[PDB]
PDB file of C-alpha atoms in Angstrom:
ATOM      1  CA  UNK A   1       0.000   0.000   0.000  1.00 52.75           C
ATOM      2  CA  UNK A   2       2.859   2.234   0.448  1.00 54.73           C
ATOM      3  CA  UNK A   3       6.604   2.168  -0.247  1.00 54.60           C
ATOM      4  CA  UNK A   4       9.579   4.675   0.455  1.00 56.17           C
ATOM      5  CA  UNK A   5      12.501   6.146   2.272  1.00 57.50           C
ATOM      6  CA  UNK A   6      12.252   6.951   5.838  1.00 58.76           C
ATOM      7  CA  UNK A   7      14.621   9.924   6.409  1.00 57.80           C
ATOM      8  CA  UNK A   8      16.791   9.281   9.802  1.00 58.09           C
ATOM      9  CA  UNK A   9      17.114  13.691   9.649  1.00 61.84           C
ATOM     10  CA  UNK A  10      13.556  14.149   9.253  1.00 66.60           C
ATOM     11  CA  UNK A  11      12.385  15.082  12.958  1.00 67.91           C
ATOM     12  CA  UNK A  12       8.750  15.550  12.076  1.00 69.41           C
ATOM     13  CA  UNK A  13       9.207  11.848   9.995  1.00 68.14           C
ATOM     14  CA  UNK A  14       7.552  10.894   6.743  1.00 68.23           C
ATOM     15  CA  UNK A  15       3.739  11.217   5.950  1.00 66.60           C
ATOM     16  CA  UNK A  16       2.876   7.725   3.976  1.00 65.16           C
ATOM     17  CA  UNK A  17      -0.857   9.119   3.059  1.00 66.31           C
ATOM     18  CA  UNK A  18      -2.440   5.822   4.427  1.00 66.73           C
ATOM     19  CA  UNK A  19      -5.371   6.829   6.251  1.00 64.20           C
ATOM     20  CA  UNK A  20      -5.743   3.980   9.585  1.00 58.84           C
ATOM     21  CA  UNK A  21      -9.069   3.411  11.193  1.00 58.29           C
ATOM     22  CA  UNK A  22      -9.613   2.067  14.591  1.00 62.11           C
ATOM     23  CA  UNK A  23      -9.483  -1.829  14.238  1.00 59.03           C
ATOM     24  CA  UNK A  24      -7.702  -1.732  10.627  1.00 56.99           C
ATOM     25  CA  UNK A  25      -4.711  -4.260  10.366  1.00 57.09           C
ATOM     26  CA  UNK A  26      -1.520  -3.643   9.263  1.00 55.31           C
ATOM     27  CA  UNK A  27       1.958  -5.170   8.479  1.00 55.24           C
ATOM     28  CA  UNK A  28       5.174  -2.961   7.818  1.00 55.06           C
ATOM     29  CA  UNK A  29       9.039  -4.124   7.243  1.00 57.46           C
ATOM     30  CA  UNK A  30      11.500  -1.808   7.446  1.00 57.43           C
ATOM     31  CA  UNK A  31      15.551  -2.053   6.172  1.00 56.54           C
ATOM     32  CA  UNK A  32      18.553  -0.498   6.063  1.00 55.93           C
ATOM     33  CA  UNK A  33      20.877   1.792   8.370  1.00 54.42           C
ATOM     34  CA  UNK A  34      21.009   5.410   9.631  1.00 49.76           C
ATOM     35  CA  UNK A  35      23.251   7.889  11.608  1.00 51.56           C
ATOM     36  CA  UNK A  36      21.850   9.459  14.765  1.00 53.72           C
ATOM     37  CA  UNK A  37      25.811  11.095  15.094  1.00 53.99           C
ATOM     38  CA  UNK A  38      28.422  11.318  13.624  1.00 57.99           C
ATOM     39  CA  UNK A  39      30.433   9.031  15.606  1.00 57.99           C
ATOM     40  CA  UNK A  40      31.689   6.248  13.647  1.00 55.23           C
ATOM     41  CA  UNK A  41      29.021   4.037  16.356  1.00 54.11           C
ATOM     42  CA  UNK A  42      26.429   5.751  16.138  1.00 56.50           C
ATOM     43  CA  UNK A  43      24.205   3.620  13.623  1.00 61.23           C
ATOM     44  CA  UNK A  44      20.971   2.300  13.880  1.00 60.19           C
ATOM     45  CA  UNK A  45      18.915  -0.078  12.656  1.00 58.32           C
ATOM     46  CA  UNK A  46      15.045  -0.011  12.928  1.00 55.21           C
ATOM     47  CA  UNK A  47      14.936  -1.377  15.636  1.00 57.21           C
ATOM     48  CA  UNK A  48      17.396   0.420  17.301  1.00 55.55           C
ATOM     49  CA  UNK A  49      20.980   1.562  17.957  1.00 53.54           C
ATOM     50  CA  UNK A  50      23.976  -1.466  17.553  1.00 52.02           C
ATOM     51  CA  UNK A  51      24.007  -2.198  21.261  1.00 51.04           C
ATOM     52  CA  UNK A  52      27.740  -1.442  21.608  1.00 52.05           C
ATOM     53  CA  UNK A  53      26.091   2.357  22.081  1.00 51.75           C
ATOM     54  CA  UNK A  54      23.057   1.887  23.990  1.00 51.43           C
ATOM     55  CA  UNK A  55      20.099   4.780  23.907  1.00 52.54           C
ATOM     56  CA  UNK A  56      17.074   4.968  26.413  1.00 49.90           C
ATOM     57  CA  UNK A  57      13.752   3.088  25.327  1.00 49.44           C
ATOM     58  CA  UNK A  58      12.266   3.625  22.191  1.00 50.46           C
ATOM     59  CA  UNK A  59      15.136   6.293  21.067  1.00 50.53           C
ATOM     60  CA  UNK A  60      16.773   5.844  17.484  1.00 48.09           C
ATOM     61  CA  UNK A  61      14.333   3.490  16.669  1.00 52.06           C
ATOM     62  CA  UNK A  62      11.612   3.410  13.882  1.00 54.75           C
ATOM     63  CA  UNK A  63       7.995   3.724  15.108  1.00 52.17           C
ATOM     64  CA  UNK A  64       4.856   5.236  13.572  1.00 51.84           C
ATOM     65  CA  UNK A  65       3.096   7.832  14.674  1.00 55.69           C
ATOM     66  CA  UNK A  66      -0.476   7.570  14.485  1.00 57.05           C
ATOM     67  CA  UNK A  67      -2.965  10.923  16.027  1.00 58.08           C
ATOM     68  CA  UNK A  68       0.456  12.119  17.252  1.00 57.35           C
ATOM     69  CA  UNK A  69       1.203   9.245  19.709  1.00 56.51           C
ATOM     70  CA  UNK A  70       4.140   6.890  18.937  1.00 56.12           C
ATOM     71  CA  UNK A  71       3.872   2.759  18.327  1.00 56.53           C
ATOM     72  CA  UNK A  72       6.687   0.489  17.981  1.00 59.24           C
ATOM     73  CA  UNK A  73       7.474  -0.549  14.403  1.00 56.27           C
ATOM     74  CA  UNK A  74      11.282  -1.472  14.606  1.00 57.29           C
ATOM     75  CA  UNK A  75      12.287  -3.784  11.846  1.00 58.34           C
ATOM     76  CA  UNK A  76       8.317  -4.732  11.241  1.00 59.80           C
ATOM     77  CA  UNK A  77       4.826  -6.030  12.372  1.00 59.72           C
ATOM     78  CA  UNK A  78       2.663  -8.171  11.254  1.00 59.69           C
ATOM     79  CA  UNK A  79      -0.730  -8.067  11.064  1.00 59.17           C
ATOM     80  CA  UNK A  80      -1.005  -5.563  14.391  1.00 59.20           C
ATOM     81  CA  UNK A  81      -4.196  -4.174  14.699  1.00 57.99           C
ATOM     82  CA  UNK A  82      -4.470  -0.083  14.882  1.00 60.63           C
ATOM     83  CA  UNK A  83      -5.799   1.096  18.129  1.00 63.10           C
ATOM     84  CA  UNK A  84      -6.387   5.134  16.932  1.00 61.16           C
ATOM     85  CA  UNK A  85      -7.477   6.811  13.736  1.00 66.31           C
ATOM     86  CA  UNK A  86      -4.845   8.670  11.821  1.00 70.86           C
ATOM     87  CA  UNK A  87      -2.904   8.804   8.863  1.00 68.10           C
ATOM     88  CA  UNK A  88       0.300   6.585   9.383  1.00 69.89           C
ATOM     89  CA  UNK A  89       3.602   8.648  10.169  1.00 71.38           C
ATOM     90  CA  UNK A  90       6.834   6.565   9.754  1.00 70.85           C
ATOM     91  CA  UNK A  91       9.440   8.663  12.013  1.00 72.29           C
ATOM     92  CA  UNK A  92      13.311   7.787  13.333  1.00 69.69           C
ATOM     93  CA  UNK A  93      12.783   8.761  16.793  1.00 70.08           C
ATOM     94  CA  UNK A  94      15.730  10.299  17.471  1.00 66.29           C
ATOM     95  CA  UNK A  95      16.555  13.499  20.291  1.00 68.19           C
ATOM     96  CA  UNK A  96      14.270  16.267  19.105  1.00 66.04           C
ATOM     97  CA  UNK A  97      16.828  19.023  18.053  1.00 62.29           C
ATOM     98  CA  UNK A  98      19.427  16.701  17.107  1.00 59.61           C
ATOM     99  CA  UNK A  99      18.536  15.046  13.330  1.00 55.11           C
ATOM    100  CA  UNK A 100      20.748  17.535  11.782  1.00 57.26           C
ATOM    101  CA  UNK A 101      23.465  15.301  12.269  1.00 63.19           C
ATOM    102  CA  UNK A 102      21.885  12.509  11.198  1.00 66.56           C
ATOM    103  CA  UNK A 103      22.055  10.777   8.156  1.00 68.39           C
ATOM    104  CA  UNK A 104      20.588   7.811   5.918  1.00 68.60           C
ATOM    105  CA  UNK A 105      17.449   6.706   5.302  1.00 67.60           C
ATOM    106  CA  UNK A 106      15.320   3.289   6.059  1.00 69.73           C
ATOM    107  CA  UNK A 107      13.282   1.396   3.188  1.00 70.74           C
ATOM    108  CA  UNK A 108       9.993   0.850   4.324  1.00 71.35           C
ATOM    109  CA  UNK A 109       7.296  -1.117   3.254  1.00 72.43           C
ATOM    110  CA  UNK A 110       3.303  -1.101   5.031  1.00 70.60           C
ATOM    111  CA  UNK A 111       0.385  -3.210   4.169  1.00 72.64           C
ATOM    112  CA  UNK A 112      -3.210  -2.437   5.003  1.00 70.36           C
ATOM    113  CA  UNK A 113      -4.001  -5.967   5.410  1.00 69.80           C
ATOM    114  CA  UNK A 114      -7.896  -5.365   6.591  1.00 70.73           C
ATOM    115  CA  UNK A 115     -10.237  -2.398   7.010  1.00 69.99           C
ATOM    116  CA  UNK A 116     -12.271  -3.048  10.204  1.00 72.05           C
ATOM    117  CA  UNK A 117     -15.419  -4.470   9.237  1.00 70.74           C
ATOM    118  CA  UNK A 118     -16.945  -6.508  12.650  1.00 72.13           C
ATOM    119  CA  UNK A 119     -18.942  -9.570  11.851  1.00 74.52           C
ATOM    120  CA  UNK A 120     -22.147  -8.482  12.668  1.00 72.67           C
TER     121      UNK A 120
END
């Protein structure tokens, strides 16, 4: 449903235009590596910093933001069923004021795999 680069500099992250429903399904991957430094450690993957250079909970990873709150996405889901409406937000959530140092971008792929629909 949607494919593209997730900036690891983009502190407001990267609008995918899929509009999520309460009770919708969805799976995402995500690959690749970013700088949140410019340290020679200081790479991430989605689902975090190499753990040779550990960073508090959640921080430097990749999670989507969905009606402005943040959900764990790391290296992917499957199949997770959305708890808010919103349009899905990929971000690197990285130290607000510090993604000008940052660089490289994750390749991201998300699946609507069901619109809620309840048996009824």
């Amino acid at each position: 449903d949607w494919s593209g680069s997730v900036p690891a500099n983009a502190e407001n992250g990267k609008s995918t235009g899929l509009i999520l429903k309460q009770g919708d399904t969805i799976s995402v991957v995500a690959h690749g590596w970013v700088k949140y430094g410019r340290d020679n450690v200081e790479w991430a993957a989605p689902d975090g910093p190499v753990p040779n250079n550990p960073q508090p909970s959640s921080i430097a990873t990749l999670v989507a933001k969905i009606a402005n709150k943040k959900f764990a996405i790391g290296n992917g889901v499957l199949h997770k069923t959305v708890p808010v409406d919103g349009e899905l937000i990929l971000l690197f959530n990285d130290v607000p004021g510090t993604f000008g140092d940052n660089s490289g971008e994750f390749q991201v792929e998300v699946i609507i795999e069901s619109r809620y629909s309840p048996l009824k």
